[PDB]
Design a protein around this nucleic acid. Sequence first.
RNA 1: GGCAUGCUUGAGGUUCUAACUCUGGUCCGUAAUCCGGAUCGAGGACAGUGUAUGGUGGGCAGUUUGACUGGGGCGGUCUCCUCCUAAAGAGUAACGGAGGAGUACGAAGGUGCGCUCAGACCGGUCGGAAAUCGGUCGCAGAGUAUAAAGGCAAAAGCGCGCUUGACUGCGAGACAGACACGUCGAGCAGGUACGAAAGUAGGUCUUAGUGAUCCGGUGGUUCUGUAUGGAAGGGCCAUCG
RNA 2: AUCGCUGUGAAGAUGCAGUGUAUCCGCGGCUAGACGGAAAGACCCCGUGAACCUUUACUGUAGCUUUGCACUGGACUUUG
RNA 3: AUUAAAAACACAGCACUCUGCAAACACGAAAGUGGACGUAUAGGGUGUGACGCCUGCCCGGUGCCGGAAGGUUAAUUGAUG
RNA 4: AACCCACUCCCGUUGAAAAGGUAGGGGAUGACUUGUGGAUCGGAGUGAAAGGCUAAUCAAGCUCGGAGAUAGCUGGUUCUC
RNA 5: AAUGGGUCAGCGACUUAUAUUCAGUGGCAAGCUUAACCGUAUAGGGUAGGCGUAGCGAAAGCGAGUCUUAAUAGGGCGUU
Lengths: 50, 96, 76, 63
Amino acid sequence: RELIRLVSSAGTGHFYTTDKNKRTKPEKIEIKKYDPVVRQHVIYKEAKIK
Amino acid sequence: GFEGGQQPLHRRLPKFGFVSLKAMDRAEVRTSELAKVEGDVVSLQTLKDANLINQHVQRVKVMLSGEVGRAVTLKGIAATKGARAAIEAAGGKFED
Amino acid sequence: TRNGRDSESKRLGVKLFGGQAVKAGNILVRLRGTKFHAGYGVGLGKDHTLFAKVDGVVKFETKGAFGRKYVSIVAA
Amino acid sequence: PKMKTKSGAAKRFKKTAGGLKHKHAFKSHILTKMTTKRKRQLRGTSMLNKSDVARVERSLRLR
RNA sequence: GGCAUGCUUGAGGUUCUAACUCUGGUCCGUAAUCCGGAUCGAGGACAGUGUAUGGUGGGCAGUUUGACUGGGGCGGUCUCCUCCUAAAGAGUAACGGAGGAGUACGAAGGUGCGCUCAGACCGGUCGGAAAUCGGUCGCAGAGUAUAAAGGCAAAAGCGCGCUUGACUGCGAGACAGACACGUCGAGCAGGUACGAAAGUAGGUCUUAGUGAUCCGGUGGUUCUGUAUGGAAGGGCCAUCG
RNA sequence: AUCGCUGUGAAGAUGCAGUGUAUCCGCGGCUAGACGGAAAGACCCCGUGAACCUUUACUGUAGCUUUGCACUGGACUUUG
RNA sequence: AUUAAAAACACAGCACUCUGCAAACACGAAAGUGGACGUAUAGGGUGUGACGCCUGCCCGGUGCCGGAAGGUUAAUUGAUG
RNA sequence: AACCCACUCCCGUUGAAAAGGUAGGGGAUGACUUGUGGAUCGGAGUGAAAGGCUAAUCAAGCUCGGAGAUAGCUGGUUCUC
RNA sequence: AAUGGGUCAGCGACUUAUAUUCAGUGGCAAGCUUAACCGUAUAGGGUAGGCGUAGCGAAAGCGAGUCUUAAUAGGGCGUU
């Protein structure tokens, strides 16, 4: 469970932070989450915290 | 500070900010004091002629903390909303 | 084989016994999995904490099938 | 000036008319384990309670 | 492809004498095995020394080398979770008795709808006590990601369909408590899941799964920004080691 | 104004309790006790004491050594 | 010196190793001086300890000695972004 | 034998003596003993080596300074209700 | 039967400076107070500076409010 970053599909630079088991679920996560800087729900699609 | 050897409060909590060098020469002069200058004018040097404000201060805001007493003129000196209201109410005026 | 090792004794049990005036957020029972169930105006938090949702006095009624102990608050 | 305030105490404890403000611990560098509800409630600038006041303003040279 | 050469530079070798060296000869200062000066010789841009730099370096130096402990040494143990000890509220010691943890999970979360497990029985043409089922009796003994305890029919167990509330801002009020920490949370606002709708949803049946500050790294920012406009650096917010 | 015993007691008593013995004071001897005198125990423990020795503890340093740049030049040849 | 005179140290003899002279080496921030007005049969270090018979096996570790020249590698250079 | 030493016993231990005496003992032409003068000194000398010695002092002399080092330790802390 | 003291007489241990906090006690009072220094000098002068009359915020700033916040909502701190 190495930790990842879920950045917002909207134009902001807001990110939620979580984990993932890489060696079982290697594909990326496209979960719809709530962005506070635009104040609507948008998809989040990211990894690579560095 | 020493708590017997555990981490004391002044090393266990974070440091939180900066001090502004902008505000070392700042000042505030409340409306109770504006009748104390002489000459029917409140200026920066006039507020330094009375001991109402230090030397090496440059920015004065006037806030509302009482009664303005007189009808004074405030040149070059900022004022809050209620204080500008209470100065202009009791005969004062305001320029720069 | 060797043997030490306890834990820090989580202070569980009944706060606010059965006639006491309660305010609308007070912890009733600290609980390790529902000894006492949630009654009339009481809440059942995450770790099975019973808390008060309204004011009144604690009841502690043994009600119904399954022999369950209920904490309820009667607005009195 | 013939009394030296501890400089690490002055960076940690700003004095207001309500007491001595400080920030909280635990909002550094391990922030995925914590829930948002813990990270939300260490975010502000709290007061300093009674057991700590005499020690801190003896360190901050005010006693 | 490159013909040729100079206008250059960088590493080697050989040679030269003029720097430099000589604890070589001979004069002279001088009546001096010092030291200079002159000259002859020999080495020679090496040696050597200054500064920078890698290597070696107990030759020397300043230190460190934990606590508990039926004295000390040895072994063991240090943080966290569950039961007993624990005296029917909390709490409660021992190098007392027993076990565990340093995580998993994008579904093992949310919601709507649906459903009960396990066991004897008796059934012989590969399994024969046993798999697959048809359940008569049944009568929670099953299961719960994981230790133990405590809980589970509104099942918190199990299956399926949709799906992200594993939201943001907070937060009345309590529990715990020396402090730093910690625990629960109705409600309000903004946006969303499911559901026809009441409603449920701020993760997981619950309690372990962890680590302060100071340093640094990264992304924002309304703030600051040492004459001024910017930057640099700092601050706050989010995050990593 | 300084006995014995048996107990008791910070746990081995001239001094406490009970009880026996015992006129007052030397001198010569002997050392069983006064946990006798001498030295703020050397053994043991402890001190976030010290000293000095060791090394493959940590961090350094003298010395030794490598190269760069100076002091340091010309001339050829091989060569990028 | 003042609780240990010994089986301890030394020793002749032995072997290893260094040192070509402005020697290795030592004391000296250096100049200098000892080694030595000596010169490898000399001089320093080390171990062993007259004599007699002898002094076996191992070069992995660590040191010391030599060897190519491949990787690594410092200051200094200062291409490029 | 002198001289130099110090193996043994006994005495002495508040000594005649802060290391001796009496009986015995070892060397006694040498790697001997000794006078006088000189040299080496404090992480520093010298050592046929014992941590020996360096002014009755030695696992780092003495003295004066830093200095009233430091001591979570020991001891003490003075009239009255 | 742990330590210490043979005895006497002298001596021998909470001081001082500078900053500060609290109490008590005074002077002035929305103000109080001077430091160096001047002074025919414990006077008088000198109010530079210090603290108080306003807070909040890390800050810009805004101010009887302010900070957080998308929020005139909540909440923190503050205000005869």
